[PDB]
Amino acid sequence: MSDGRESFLEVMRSVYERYLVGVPGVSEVWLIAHADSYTGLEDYDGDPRDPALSEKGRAQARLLAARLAGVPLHGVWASGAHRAQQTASAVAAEHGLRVRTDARLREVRTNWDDGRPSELKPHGVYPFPEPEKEVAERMRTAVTAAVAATPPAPDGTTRVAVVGHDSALVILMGSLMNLGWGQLDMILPLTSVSVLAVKDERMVVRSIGDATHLAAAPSDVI
Amino acid sequence: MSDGRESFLEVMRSVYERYLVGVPGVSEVWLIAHADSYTGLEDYDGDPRDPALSEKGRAQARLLAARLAGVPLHGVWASGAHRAQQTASAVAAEHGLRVRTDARLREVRTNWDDGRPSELKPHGVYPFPEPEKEVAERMRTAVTAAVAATPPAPDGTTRVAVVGHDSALVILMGSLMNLGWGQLDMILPLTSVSVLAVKDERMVVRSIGDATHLAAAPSDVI
Numbered sequence: 001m002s003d004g005r006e007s008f009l010e011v012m013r014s015v016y017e018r019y020l021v022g023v024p025g026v027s028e029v030w031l032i033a034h035a036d037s038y039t040g041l042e043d044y045d046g047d048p049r050d051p052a053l054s055e056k057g058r059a060q061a062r063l064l065a066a067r068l069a070g071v072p073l074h075g076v077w078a079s080g081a082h083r084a085q086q087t088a089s090a091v092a093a094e095h096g097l098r099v100r101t102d103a104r105l106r107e108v109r110t111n112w113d114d115g116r117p118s119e120l121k122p123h124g125v126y127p128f129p130e131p132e133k134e135v136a137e138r139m140r141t142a143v144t145a146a147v148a149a150t151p152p153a154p155d156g157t158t159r160v161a162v163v164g165h166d167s168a169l170v171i172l173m174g175s176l177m178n179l180g181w182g183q184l185d186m187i188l189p190l191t192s193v194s195v196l197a198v199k200d201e202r203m204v205v206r207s208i209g210d211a212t213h214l215a216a217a218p219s220d221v222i
Numbered sequence: 223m224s225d226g227r228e229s230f231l232e233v234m235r236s237v238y239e240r241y242l243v244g245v246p247g248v249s250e251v252w253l254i255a256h257a258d259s260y261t262g263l264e265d266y267d268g269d270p271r272d273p274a275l276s277e278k279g280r281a282q283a284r285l286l287a288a289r290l291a292g293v294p295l296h297g298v299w300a301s302g303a304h305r306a307q308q309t310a311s312a313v314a315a316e317h318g319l320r321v322r323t324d325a326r327l328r329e330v331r332t333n334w335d336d337g338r339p340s341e342l343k344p345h346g347v348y349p350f351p352e353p354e355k356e357v358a359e360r361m362r363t364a365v366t367a368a369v370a371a372t373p374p375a376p377d378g379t380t381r382v383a384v385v386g387h388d389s390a391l392v393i394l395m396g397s398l399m400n401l402g403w404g405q406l407d408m409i410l411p412l413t414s415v416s417v418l419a420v421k422d423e424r425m426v427v428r429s430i431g432d433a434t435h436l437a438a439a440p441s442d443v444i
């Protein structure tokens with residue numbers, strides 16, 4: 001009764017509200033890293049900078065789409081890249097949704113894109129020619145624009161899936177926590193799910209990098 | 223063919239290996255926050271500091287157990303708190319395992335534990351009387367022990383589930399990234415799954431805070 005439990009619960013509620021938990025009008029954005037397109041790239045005769053999914057990637061996307069089949073989704077967005085579109089299509093096909101495209105969801109520009117050799121940088125050294133703040137801002141505006149183009153769901157939480165690219169996604173999530181490259185020291189697995197909570201222009205990182213739909217899969221799928 | 227794709231792929235493989243992705247002999251720790259015990263706590267007739275799960279928490283634990291039913295698990299550990307034990311019991315029984323207890327997984331000591339009203343701190347201000355460094359040390363010890371206690375499984379990835387408490391868990395994961403309280407600025411949802419990848423004495427934060435198994439449930443389940 002008056003034994004500290006009231007103070008504990010009220011403060012917990014206040015903490016939850018800072019992270020948009022227990023707050024009306026919150027939408028969720030499920031950020032999805034595209035599935036594998038690099039197995040076999042050494043022998044690929046298509047555009048090697050815009051490859052289709054590999055056989056392994058098709059299998060990952062099928063596991064992802066099954067995982068998300070039961071989740072109410074109200075929109076699916078993708079970058080213009082084949083690997084993102086193809087992943088998004090697998091997801092959207094379980095929901096009666098059409099994949100909407102936003103080129104601003106593209107991966108960070110890489111040395112590879114510029115036709116230069118790639119180099120392995122030390123931890124914490126930003127490795128891309130497109131600056132981190134520019135990547136973060138185009139991801140932030142692409143995400144809030146996808147929410148603004150999604151009508152609020154009539155029952156419960158509006159949820160938008162956004163299929164993008166692992167480096168640009170982890171840059172977005174770090175920037176949302178006011179962290180620079182290397183501080184949020186993670187790589188997002190292919191087909192991983194990361195959740196943001198969004199209300200008006202405010203965006204909160206709720207979960208990061210979960211590819212647990214692959215946990216029981218054979219090793220040639222991981 | 224030798225158009226920059228080979229250096230791109232070689233760098234990519236090296237980056238994956240730094241984060242234990244696609245590396246043989248890696249184990250996983252699934253860090254699980256216990257299920258709800260706070261709904262209705264204001265009227266709870268037992269010990270409010272060590273309560274059983276609520277009706278809502280039992281529903282969350284059921285959804286969590288169903289999520290993990292198809293995931294191979296080779297050990298289940300929990301703190302001694304009833305709410306952690308009850309959350310773990312739902313997971314363990316479906317994998318043919320007894321729940322094992324390690325009190326080093328207990329929640330950070332709170333103002334409530336010390337007889338002071340809970341106080342809402344500004345973001346970034348550490349709110350507990352047990353120092354962060356001490357919480358991180360005992361959590362790392364406990365997880366290291368849970369990994370060491372689990373014999374390698376002969377199929378796929380060896381996996382240990384560890385059911386604990388959200389503040390201690392996010393302290394551990396921040397510490398594993400050499401970050402202090404408030405930098406990894408997240409609260410972990412109840413029944414959320416976070417994953418560490420482990421090989422030798424190296425622990426990598428793989429994923430954080432996923433409670434997507436709750437997304438299809440009724441709204442009174444979160």
Ligand SMILES: Cc1cc2nc3c(=O)[nH]c(=O)nc-3n(C[C@H](O)[C@H](O)[C@H](O)CO)c2cc1C
Binds near residue numbers: 127167
């Ligand atoms: C933490 C991390 C470190 C990275 N390091 C490099 C690197 O040093 N050089 C490079 O060309 N790409 C790097 N990348 C990109 C990466 O190797 C690969 O191209 C993409 O992650 C695959 O989608 C890195 C990405 C992340 C997330």
Ligand SMILES: Cc1cc2nc3c(=O)[nH]c(=O)nc-3n(C[C@H](O)[C@H](O)[C@H](O)CO)c2cc1C
Binds near residue numbers: 349388
């Ligand atoms: C990011 C974060 C900030 C929190 N801030 C406080 C706080 O200011 N005061 C407090 O009593 N508990 C705080 N907590 C604990 C929280 O309110 C609650 O007691 C636990 O999360 C319940 O398991 C915090 C927890 C997190 C992870």
